[PDB]
């Protein structure tokens, strides 16, 4: 069902959740002044969600969430990323530098407090109501310093919601000793992670396992050999009951961002500026990239990370536009607007209408600047690799005109380091020359001369419109065109050479214009934000908060729905559950992304499923539900009617791409790995039987 | 249900058809001694099926069956391919050169008569039992020729069935005045042409409409202004009643070929020789062709057809090999013969075990020759375009040696003409040289020196193993290597230059070996053929014809089944009926194949469906059914329980690719346009009301 609901809004949605089939008592789920299930959910490493699943602080999250920790501990001799990792005792669990989980200990509405404090500010246009700094001063005042010393391991944060109409203060408890316990092999963790991505049906066992360490009192500590497993206040029970079509499902986690209150005019800017330009520019780029990879297997190895990441956002823009074309996302947002404008007339408050119109006027005023910004961002900053070639720092330049021959040698070395990072083993000068001519030919068509970055004027003024000649010249004459050319510079480096380096001048010139457009555009955000406060204040006051959730902002939200398949198109049905069968169907042993693990393949043939198979002897892999999730929800616990853990959220289907702006009940689905499958893999692929022992597994 | 059954087999199968939902009386479907539905079926233009749907000789078949006729009547001022075509009176219907329809007027079993005649052949290994030249003699004798003079418009033919254990004599009624009446625009006839090819779901309105003209008596006659519409013996009534899941469907038509009685050793050869080599060699070919098409907009246009043509049987091979890999085709065939061998033991007759062993032994003996044939057929004869460059005829050679200038120039003219048709507007020697190098490298890798075509020995001996320099030389020195080179030859021709022309030597040498290998493999066919006659005789004696149909052979068969969807893979369920919404869902005005017709589009937005809509107010397009069809069944009528026309067959799903060898009930499906959609396009897109008025449309 629609919405990413504040924990504070559980009471107000408890009956609908009962309607859909929630069995828990409300306070067992979220208790605002005691222990509850909420206390078992964590923000994992700042972006993902995870959950505690044993009284020794064992934490589950996605494989894609643990990926970096698994890679950092992997080499040629012991490639955990490929083979997996299962520490057979707690001492073999690996610490991670720069890792966190965070608990949401307390949450409290501090709206009236914050609004009282905001009346002390003179300027009625102050943006302090959304300043993190200001909001932190208020938080520190209420807590209030020395709060962190008096409460070791806790901190406080205030955040804004409903465009500045509601304020929450969060008391967080943060741990930074979190060790890798286990992960499956990449053939399970990422089964088809580029082809099957954004896609249902899905067969990916996207999980990994960690453990929170603490000091002997259970309070936070940085890594030390003294530290011992956390004994948490709450962990999730794992259920073997499985799922059935229409079963209740709910999620807690940390959705990042949504745009639920966009005006129609913002839908038009979003479609015809952000997305069209992204789609256009990324088509040209991927064009040249694809043909170069097909024409050379070396280039294919080098450019398929970069080509891949260019898709995973391009594709999101294709899908987003498809939602405006076919799902009337615009007319939906126009309707919300008019309902409110009418309503403001009936009440004799015209300010709602004025807010909407102040947004439209602002959107209209900034359209060419924004178009120029997106052109340069997508076309040059993201689009041409030599856009990010090295530029000397102040300090470096200063050294190269000094007399300190060794400060001369140090500055060169920092640049040699950045040069080799730019021109690494995945960089091809010739590929990027091709990419550049295409991207620049599109950029100069779409951007008139007197709006160009200063160095791009040279194409007309010096190369007689010849873009090839301009790019060739950059590489022929630059100290960053080849290893040779850089080396020759480093031998007799003058500050004068770098000042005329045409690649330096390019990279600087385009960055000046990116920066300049960004700064010109920044003042246009304030009126839209101020107008939104009013717009949303109106929307809440007219209907209510009950069917109008607050935009996500990387705070703890819950969402509910049912396990349910859907129909993506005429005469097709996807059901609610995938099976291990479906993994084997997709096998292609000569495709990296569809490799099937020898032990898993073997566990399949021998039907060796413990009591992790379903009512008919089929081994489940993944299921999907009507929950409302987004980026940030990676690793979120999925709970059955008794708040028992039934799976981990890991993706959203491509038909719900536009669900950060409008939710589509018949299409949007959360994509969840089945907890039975997670266990099977622990048990039968890992053989890491100690982890099943410590969970509290139930019917 | 499995089977392409003989009309002779209707009585044996009639109960099974009643069980599946058949209503009508047997003898209204097929009667040897009078009029029956069978009389409404035609062999349309050699390879398609069609059906008579009015008392004035109106004929429906597929659009892809009517394609060439439509394209032949299209100029730029009136492009009927693009816009459709609708004659508004019978006198506007457009004649067609080299066209026919063929009724099957009678069918007699002539097994005994054919067996008697074959005892007078002394050699017990004569292949006369399968000879068309011979069987036509026995036909002529039985029919007392001059039969075609005594009965103008009629003719006779005998064919063999069940590998020579059953003969039928057909009496054919051939009309050759057959005129274009109605086509929908290609956007409907070929909606999704190549994306949706071999695919369910499907949204393609694949029909066209013709009329049979004849003389005053309704007797056949070539085109003439004096000709008027044929009053046929039977036409189909058209049903507005529609389809539901599990409704009886049945088809009549002319399936081309099947290999249902393959031995498991025939399956293994087909996989590892025939299919694997085509897959290997076409992958290569197609790769090189893609690079170049992506590389140059003009090569794409030049080479798109040829690439698609290569893609056809490549995809078809890929599917067959899926089915062997995962559906146990070989096991099914192995089981077949295992049962008959066991049963033959029991009878005390080794006949069958001796036969199967012979097939085994012959398939083993011919494997290297056959591996060589497929390597040369896929690798060069089809792979390399300049393999089909001109070779001088006996006659042209003979004229370039004479003293006859007139004959010398006529020779050159003929050669110029074949040169222009080979080096035509779609021909690129750069592309051809690139393909040729990829393909020859694989060929010289597989095929050793002693088995090369003679000219290919030059790579090793003359060009130091450098395939690229060989192809360079062929083009550099050949008279067919460029237009100018040819013209320098035409000015001063001589046999000696053609004799030493490296391209002529290449194309001669590769065709010599191709012919040569074809000829050495020819003797191996007879043992297999004769052994098959015994093998199929044994299976029939053992298990009867009940659930054992005779291989297709371009003769009239019936098939039955039910309208039913299916699950193509895990968690995916395709249903039985597609809708006009599905068309709309696919609209994509930039992509050529998914353009939607404005007038069709408008009928949808108006819900202007008359009595064509299904009872829930939705407009059907296509349906699928478990009928057993193959190539030859294009345009075939689909009938309901009462034998009323409910649709037109036009494709098979790829999931059923192995259907010609192994029928896959849960997976294989005939793809059928709903006759209600057909009428919709006549009514609301043609506006061609007279065609509906002349039909008999029942509820």
Whole-angstrom Cα distance, residue A684 to residue A468?
58
Cβ(B669)–Cβ(B566) under 8 Å? yes
Active site residues of A: 64, 206, 634
DSSP B695: B
Whole-angstrom Cα distance, residue B676 to residue B609?
10
User: Does the beta-carbon distance from B582 to A570 stay under 8 Å?
Assistant: yes
Cβ(A540)–Cβ(A162) under 8 Å? yes
**Neighbouring residues of B200: CB distance < 8 A, sequence distance ≥ 6:** B574, B624, B653, B655, B669, B671
Residues B549 and B419 in one domain: no
Antiparallel, parallel or unpaired: β A228-229 and A208-214:
antiparallel
Cβ(A641)–Cβ(A248) under 8 Å? yes
- B180: distance to nearest CA of chain A, Å? 33
Whole-angstrom Cα distance, residue A102 to residue B244?
57
Cβ(B1)–Cβ(B543) under 8 Å? no
Of the candidates B54, B100, B187, B634, the residue annotated as catalytic is B634
Query: B622: closest CA among B574, B677, B541, B567?
Result: B677
Whole-angstrom Cα distance, residue A613 to residue B121?
67
User: Does the beta-carbon distance from A577 to B569 stay under 8 Å?
Assistant: no
Helix (H, G, I), strand (E, B) or coil at A20: helix
Query: Is A125 exposed, middle or buried, given 0-12, 13-18 or 19+ CB atoms closer than 10 A?
Result: exposed
Whole-angstrom Cα distance, residue B22 to residue B644?
11
Residues A238 and A323 in one domain: no
* A520 backbone dihedrals φ, ψ, rounded to 5°: -65, -40
Q: Is A230 left (phi over 0), alpha (psi -120 to 50) or beta?
A: beta
Query: B637: closest CA among B246, B249, B309, B159?
Result: B249
If you measure CA to CA, which chain B residue comes closest to A623? Answer: B571
- A593: distance to nearest CA of chain B, Å? 18
SS3 sequence of A214-270 = ECCCCCCCCCCCCCEECCCCCCCCEECCCCCCCCEEEEEECCCCCCCCCCHHHHHHH
Query: Is A219 exposed, middle or buried, given 0-12, 13-18 or 19+ CB atoms closer than 10 A?
Result: middle
Residues A126 and A263 in one domain: no
Antiparallel, parallel or unpaired: β A670-674 and A697-698:
unpaired
Q: Which two tokens stand for residue A520?
A: 């010109």
DSSP B456: G
- H-state helical runs in A465-524: 467-477, 483-491, 495-500, 502-521
Q: Which two tokens stand for residue A643?
A: 């708040």
Cβ(A467)–Cβ(A440) under 8 Å? yes
| Distance (Å) of CA B278 to CA A129, B165, B343, B386, B654 | 70, 33, 38, 19, 18
Whole-angstrom Cα distance, residue B261 to residue B266?
9
Antiparallel, parallel or unpaired: β B697-698 and B238-239:
parallel
Whole-angstrom Cα distance, residue A326 to residue B279?
40
> CA angle A492-A493-A498, nearest 5°?
140
DSSP per-residue letters across A277-323: HHHHHHHHHHHHHHHHHHT-HHHHHHHHHHHHHHHHHHHHHHHHHHH
Cβ(A606)–Cβ(A220) under 8 Å? no
Domain count of the fold of chain B: 2
Whole-angstrom Cα distance, residue B564 to residue B394?
59
Cβ(A615)–Cβ(A654) under 8 Å? no
Residues B251 and B261 in one domain: no
The rounded Cα A174 to chain-centroid distance in angstroms is: 21
Name which of A202, A243, A570, A620 to mutate to probe chain B: the one with the most chain B Cβ atoms within 10 A of its Cβ: A570
User: Does the beta-carbon distance from B573 to A572 stay under 8 Å?
Assistant: yes
If you measure CA to CA, which chain B residue comes closest to A581? Answer: B570
Whole-angstrom Cα distance, residue B314 to residue B308?
10
Q: How many distinct helices (H) and strands (E) make up chain A? A: 27, 22
User: Does the beta-carbon distance from B201 to A573 stay under 8 Å?
Assistant: no
Place of tokens 């909407």: A356
Query: Is B445 exposed, middle or buried, given 0-12, 13-18 or 19+ CB atoms closer than 10 A?
Result: exposed
Q: Which two tokens stand for residue B26?
A: 């047997």
Query: B502: closest CA among B477, B468, B523, B522?
Result: B477
CB count within 10 Å of CB B189 equals 25
Using beta carbons and an 8 Å cutoff, which residues of B are at the interface with A?
201, 203, 290-291, 294-295, 565, 569-579, 581-582, 585
Peptide bond into A430 cis (omega under 30): no
Cβ(A74)–Cβ(A676) under 8 Å? no
Whole-angstrom Cα distance, residue B573 to residue B562?
17
CB count within 10 Å of CB B115 equals 14
Place of tokens 């039934």: A646
CB count within 10 Å of CB A477 equals 13
Residues A234 and A261 in one domain: no
What count of Cα atoms within 13 Å lies in the side-chain half-sphere of residue A462? 14
Antiparallel, parallel or unpaired: β B670-674 and A620-625:
unpaired
User: Does the beta-carbon distance from A571 to B569 stay under 8 Å?
Assistant: no
Cβ(B672)–Cβ(B622) under 8 Å? yes
What does the longest C-alpha to C-alpha distance in chain B come to?
A: 82
Place of tokens 């169907």: A585
Whole-angstrom Cα distance, residue A379 to residue A441?
10
- Cα-trace Rg, chain B: 28
Cβ(A239)–Cβ(A699) under 8 Å? yes
Query: B228: closest CA among B244, B210, B215, B243?
Result: B215
User: Does the beta-carbon distance from B572 to A574 stay under 8 Å?
Assistant: yes
End-to-end CA distance of chain B: 27
Helix (H, G, I), strand (E, B) or coil at B628: coil
- Please say which residue of B520, B544, B568 terminates a domain: B544
Q: Which residues precede a break in chain B, with C-to-N distance above 2.5 Å?
A: none
Q: Which two tokens stand for residue B14?
A: 């009639």
Residues A480 and A395 in one domain: yes
> CA angle B384-B388-B389, nearest 5°?
110
Residues A468 and A579 in one domain: no
Q: Which two tokens stand for residue A247?
A: 């079963």
End-to-end CA distance of chain A: 26
The percent helix, strand, coil of chain A (3-state, each to 5) is 50, 15, 35
Whole-angstrom Cα distance, residue A227 to residue B54?
90
Cβ(A497)–Cβ(A505) under 8 Å? no
Residues B431 and B578 in one domain: no
Q: Residues of A565-582 as b/e, b for ≥16 C-beta within 10 angstroms?
A: bbebebbbbbbbbbbbbb
User: Does the beta-carbon distance from A571 to B201 stay under 8 Å?
Assistant: yes
* B620 backbone dihedrals φ, ψ, rounded to 5°: -75, 155
Q: Residues of A485-520 as b/e, b for ≥16 C-beta within 10 angstroms?
A: bbeebeeebeeeebeebbbbbbbbbbbebbeebeee
SS3 sequence of B494-558 = CHHHHHHCHHHHHHHHHHHHHHHHHHHHHHHHHHHHHHHHHHHHHHHHHHCCCCCCCCCECCCEE
Of the candidates B1, B39, B177, B206, the residue annotated as catalytic is B206
Whole-angstrom Cα distance, residue A360 to residue A524?
12
Helix (H, G, I), strand (E, B) or coil at A364: helix
Cβ(B314)–Cβ(B274) under 8 Å? no
Task: Give bridge partners of residue A173 from the DSSP assignment.
Answer: A103, A154
Query: Is A479 exposed, middle or buried, given 0-12, 13-18 or 19+ CB atoms closer than 10 A?
Result: buried
Q: Which two tokens stand for residue A362?
A: 């602002």
Q: Which two tokens stand for residue A154?
A: 């806790």
- A642: distance to nearest CA of chain B, Å? 27
SS3 sequence of B201-223 = CCCCCCCEEEEEEECCCCCCCCC
Look at chain A and count its residues: 699
Name which of B296, B571, B616 to mutate to probe chain A: the one with the most chain A Cβ atoms within 10 A of its Cβ: B571
Task: Give bridge partners of residue A49 from the DSSP assignment.
Answer: A43
Place of tokens 């615009």: A330
Cβ(B191)–Cβ(B594) under 8 Å? yes
Place of tokens 């009301």: B689
Residues B130 and B268 in one domain: no
SS3 sequence of A593-605 = HHCCCHHHHHHHH
Cβ(B698)–Cβ(B642) under 8 Å? no
Antiparallel, parallel or unpaired: β A177-183 and A58-61:
unpaired
Q: Which residues precede a break in chain A, with C-to-N distance above 2.5 Å?
A: none
Cβ(B665)–Cβ(B547) under 8 Å? no
**Neighbouring residues of B649: CB distance < 8 A, sequence distance ≥ 6:** B49, B251, B253, B627, B629, B633, B634, B635, B636, B637, B638, B670, B671, B672
Antiparallel, parallel or unpaired: β B41-44 and B101-109:
antiparallel
- B571: distance to nearest CA of chain A, Å? 5
Q: Which two tokens stand for residue B383?
A: 């792979």
Whole-angstrom Cα distance, residue A225 to residue A213?
10
Torsion of the alpha carbons at A109, A113, A116 and A117, rounded to the nearest 10 = -120
Residues A208 and A326 in one domain: no
- Please say which residue of B511, B544, B577 terminates a domain: B544
Torsion of the alpha carbons at A159, A160, A165 and A170, rounded to the nearest 10 = -20
- A314: distance to nearest CA of chain B, Å? 18
- Please say which residue of A519, A544, A569 terminates a domain: A544
If you measure CA to CA, which chain A residue comes closest to B203? Answer: A570
Using beta carbons and an 8 Å cutoff, which residues of A are at the interface with B?
201, 203, 290-291, 294-295, 326, 565, 569-575, 577-579, 581-582, 585
* A635 backbone dihedrals φ, ψ, rounded to 5°: 95, 0
Place of tokens 């005469």: A571
Q: Which two tokens stand for residue B84?
A: 């459709």
Resolution of this PDB entry, in A? 2.7
Judging contacts by C-beta atoms under 8 Å, the chain B residues touching residue A294 are 290-291, 294
| Distance (Å) of CA A411 to CA A14, A27, A420 | 63, 61, 14
Give me the domain span that covers residue A319.
257-544
Residues A540 and A583 in one domain: no
What count of Cα atoms within 13 Å lies in the side-chain half-sphere of residue B335? 6
Cβ(B695)–Cβ(B58) under 8 Å? yes
Q: Which helix (H) or strand (E) holds B624?
A: strand B620-625
Q: Which two tokens stand for residue A164?
A: 């500045």
User: Does the beta-carbon distance from A572 to B201 stay under 8 Å?
Assistant: yes
Residues A540 and A559 in one domain: no
Cβ(B201)–Cβ(B673) under 8 Å? no
* B259 backbone dihedrals φ, ψ, rounded to 5°: -130, 55
If you measure CA to CA, which chain B residue comes closest to A619? Answer: B570
* A329 backbone dihedrals φ, ψ, rounded to 5°: -60, -35
């Amino acid at each position: 069902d629609e919405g990413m609901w504040l924990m504070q809004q559980l009471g107000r949605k408890y009956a609908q959740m009962k309607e859909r089939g929630l069995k828990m008592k409300e306070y067992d789920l979220y208790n605002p002044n005691g222990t509850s299930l909420k206390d078992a959910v964590v923000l994992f490493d700042g972006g993902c969600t995870g959950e505690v699943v044993s009284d020794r602080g064992l934490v589950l999250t996605n494989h894609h969430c643990g990926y970096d920790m698994i890679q950092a501990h992997s080499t040629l001799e012991h490639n955990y990323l490929e083979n997996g990792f299962w520490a057979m005792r707690e001492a073999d669990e690996l610490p991670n530098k720069d890792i966190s989980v965070v608990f949401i200990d307390k949450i409290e509405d501090v709206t009236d407090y914050v609004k009282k404090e905001l009346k002390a500010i003179k300027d009625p246009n102050s943006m302090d109501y959304l300043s993190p700094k200001y909001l932190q001063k208020l938080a520190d005042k209420k807590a209030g310093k020395n709060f962190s010393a008096k409460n070791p391991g806790l901190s406080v944060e205030i955040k804004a919601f409903y465009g500045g109409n509601l304020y929450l203060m969060f008391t967080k408890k943060t741990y930074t000793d979190v060790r890798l316990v286990g992960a499956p092999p990449s053939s399970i963790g990422k089964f088809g992670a580029d082809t099957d991505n954004w896609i249902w049906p899905r067969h990916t066992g996207d999980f990994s396992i960690f453990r929170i360490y603490a000091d002997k009192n259970g309070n936070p500590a940085p890594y030390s050999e003294d530290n011992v497993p956390l004994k948490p206040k709450r962990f999730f029970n794992i259920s073997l009951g499985g799922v059935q079509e229409n079963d209740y499902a709910m999620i807690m986690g940390f959705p990042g961002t949504t745009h639920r209150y966009f005006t129609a005019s913002e839908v038009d800017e979003w479609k015809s500026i952000d997305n069209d330009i992204r789609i256009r520019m990324r088509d040209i780029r991927q064009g040249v990239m694809l043909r170069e990879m097909l024409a050379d297997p070396q280039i294919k190895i080098m450019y398929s990370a970069k080509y891949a990441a260019s898709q995973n956002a391009y594709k999101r823009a294709i899908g987003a536009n498809w939602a405006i074309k076919t799902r009337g996302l615009r007319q939906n947002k126009q309707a919300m607007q008019d309902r409110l404008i009418a309503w403001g007339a009936k009440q004799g408050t015209p300010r709602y209408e004025e807010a909407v119109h102040e947004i439209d006027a602002t959107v209209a005023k900034r359209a060419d600047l924004r178009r120029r910004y997106w052109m340069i961002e997508e076309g040059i900053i993201r689009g041409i690799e030599f856009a990010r070639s090295p530029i000397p720092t102040e300090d470096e330049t200063k050294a190269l005109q000094g007399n300190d021959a060794s400060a001369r040698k140090e500055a060169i070395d920092k640049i040699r380091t950045r040069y080799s990072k730019f021109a690494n083993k995945d960089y091809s000068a010739e590929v990027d020359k091709k990419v550049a001519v295409a991207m620049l030919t599109e950029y100069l068509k779409e951007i008139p001369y007197e709006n160009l970055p200063l160095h791009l004027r040279l194409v007309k003024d010096r190369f007689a419109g010849d873009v090839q000649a301009y790019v060739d010249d950059i590489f022929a004459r630059s100290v960053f065109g080849s290893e040779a050319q850089f080396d020759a510079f480093a031998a007799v480096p003058s500050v004068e050479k770098l000042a005329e380096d045409p690649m330096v001048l390019f990279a600087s010139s385009v960055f000046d214009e990116y920066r300049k457009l960004y700064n010109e555009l920044r003042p246009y955000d304030d009126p839209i934000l101020r107008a939104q406060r009013t717009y949303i204040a109106g929307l809440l006051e007219m209907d209510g908060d009950q069917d109008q959730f607050p935009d996500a902002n990387l705070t703890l939200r819950f969402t509910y729905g049912q396990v349910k398949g859907y129909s993506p198109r005429d005469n097709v049905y996807y059901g609610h559950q995938t099976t291990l069968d479906g993994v084997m169907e997709k096998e292609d042993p000569d495709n990296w992304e569809f490799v099937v693990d020898p032990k898993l393949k073997a566990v399949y043939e021998r039907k060796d499923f413990g009591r992790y198979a379903d009512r008919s002897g089929r081994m489940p892999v993944a299921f999907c539900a009507t929950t409302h999730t987004t980026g940030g929800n990676s690793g979120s616990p999925v709970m059955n009617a008794n708040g028992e853990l039934i799976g981990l959220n890991f993706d959203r289907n491509w038909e719900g791409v536009g669900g950060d702006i409008q939710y589509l009940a018949d299409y949007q689905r959360s994509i969840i790995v089945d907890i039975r499958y997670v266990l099977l893999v622990i048990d039968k692929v890992g053989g890491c039987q100690r982890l099943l022992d410590e969970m509290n597994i139930v019917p």
